[PDB]
Amino acid sequence: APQQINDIVHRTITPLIEQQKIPGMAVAVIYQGKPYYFTWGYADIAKKQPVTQQTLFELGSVSKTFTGVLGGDAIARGEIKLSDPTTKYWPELTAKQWNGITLLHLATYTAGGLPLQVPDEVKSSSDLLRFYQNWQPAWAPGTQRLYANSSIGLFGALAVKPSGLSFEQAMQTRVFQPLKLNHTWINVPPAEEKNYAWGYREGKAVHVSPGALDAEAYGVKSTIEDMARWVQSNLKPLDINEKTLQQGIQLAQSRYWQTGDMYQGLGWEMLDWPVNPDSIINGSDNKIALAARPVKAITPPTPAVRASWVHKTGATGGFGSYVAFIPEKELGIVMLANKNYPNPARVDAAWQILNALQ
Numbered sequence: 001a002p003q004q005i006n007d008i009v010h011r012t013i014t015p016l017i018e019q020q021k022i023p024g025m026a027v028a029v030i031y032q033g034k035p036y037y038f039t040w041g042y043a044d045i046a047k048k049q050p051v052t053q054q055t056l057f058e059l060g061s062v063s064k065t066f067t068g069v070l071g072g073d074a075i076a077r078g079e080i081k082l083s084d085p086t087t088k089y090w091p092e093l094t095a096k097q098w099n100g101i102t103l104l105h106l107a108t109y110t111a112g113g114l115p116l117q118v119p120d121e122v123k124s125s126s127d128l129l130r131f132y133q134n135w136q137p138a139w140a141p142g143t144q145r146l147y148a149n150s151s152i153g154l155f156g157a158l159a160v161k162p163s164g165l166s167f168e169q170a171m172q173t174r175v176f177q178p179l180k181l182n183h184t185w186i187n188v189p190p191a192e193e194k195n196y197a198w199g200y201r202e203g204k205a206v207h208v209s210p211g212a213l214d215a216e217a218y219g220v221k222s223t224i225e226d227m228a229r230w231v232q233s234n235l236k237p238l239d240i241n242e243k244t245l246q247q248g249i250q251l252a253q254s255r256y257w258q259t260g261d262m263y264q265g266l267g268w269e270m271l272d273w274p275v276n277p278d279s280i281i282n283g284s285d286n287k288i289a290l291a292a293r294p295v296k297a298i299t300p301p302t303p304a305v306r307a308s309w310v311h312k313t314g315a316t317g318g319f320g321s322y323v324a325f326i327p328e329k330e331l332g333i334v335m336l337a338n339k340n341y342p343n344p345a346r347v348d349a350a351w352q353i354l355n356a357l358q
């Protein structure tokens with residue numbers, strides 16, 4: 001890495017790891033389109049395994065960005081429309097409150113109060129159907145944004161129905177493979193377990209538990225190298241040869257709703273560049289990010305804006321991730337850690353790095 005990058009990275013991340021007592025960490029900086037890597041600490045403390053450029057981290061909700069692009073790809077393929085009723089792709093969902101709830105609403109958390117989690121008791125196909133069937137909205141569709149695994153998770157399960165493929169097959173075939181993300185997994189295969197970091201929660205080694213719609217909402221695992229490639233692909237979607245994927249990425253970065261200074265895309269969230277750092281740093285606190293907020297519709301959606309800060313935070317029990325990029329500056333960061341530490345600390349650090357290099 002250019003010494004400019006070494007300097008700000010080292011000055012910023014070392015204190016962060018100490019303050020937050022993070023066991024292990026990988027960072028990628030994308031500068032003028034090119035990736036530069038940094039690793040610290042332990043993927044497995046007990047077995048003294050270092051974090052490397054091949055270590056898999058749980059991405060948590062950064063997974064939603066893959067889900068959004070896969071949905072955008074299916075739109076571009078003509079398989080689905082965001083204007084379509086949810087019930088078009090789930091005929092067994094006959095509950096009357098679903099009338100007027102479209103795929104857009106599901107993708108962008110504006111259905112009317114779908115909850116943050118699918119309940120842990122929802123295991124089977126029958127349970128899943130009964131959960132959505134019996135759900136009663138707090139608000140009308142397209143009025144309030146309330147961040148929800150149950151909203152975008154359902155979007156992702158339904159977006160892949162016309163293709164005949166499972167969510168996992170569609171993700172592999174249509175996104176991971178074309179982009180050469182050869183070390184990104186929804187399910188980590190036995191040969192890769194050697195590289196799968198443990199997460200740490202109150203000193204305990206932990207991995208994400210299975211739950212309904214996990215793959216869609218929070219279930220991807222990936223390395224710092226594949227995550228840099230993902231950033232490169234979203235920075236510059238026009239270098240992508242596969243046409244519907246190229247469109248899908250553009251669609252995931254369109255602005256569908258505004259709340260405050262933030263715009264909701266598919267998975268991705270966007271703000272105009274230059275940004276108020278306090279706004280993205282403070283707004284990342286779950287006390288704000290997870291509260292209901294009124295949305296204004298963008299009619300019709302604004303196509304991907306090059307002068308944007310595009311980002312997503314993500315967590316699991318034992319992991320904390322963050323991705324941010326500015327297409328106009330060809331500039332991005334990926335931060336992957338095996339402790340779930342506060343969101344504002346991630347955004348703060350990412351801003352310091354990107355602002356110095358901008």
Ligand SMILES: *c1nnc([C@H](NC(=O)OC(C)(C)C)C(C)C)o1
Pocket residue numbers: 060061062117149208218286290313314315316317
């Ligand atoms: C997306 N990213 N982080 C989160 C936390 N949600 C969550 O579902 O955690 C598990 C279930 C372990 C993945 C949330 C913001 C507290 O969701």
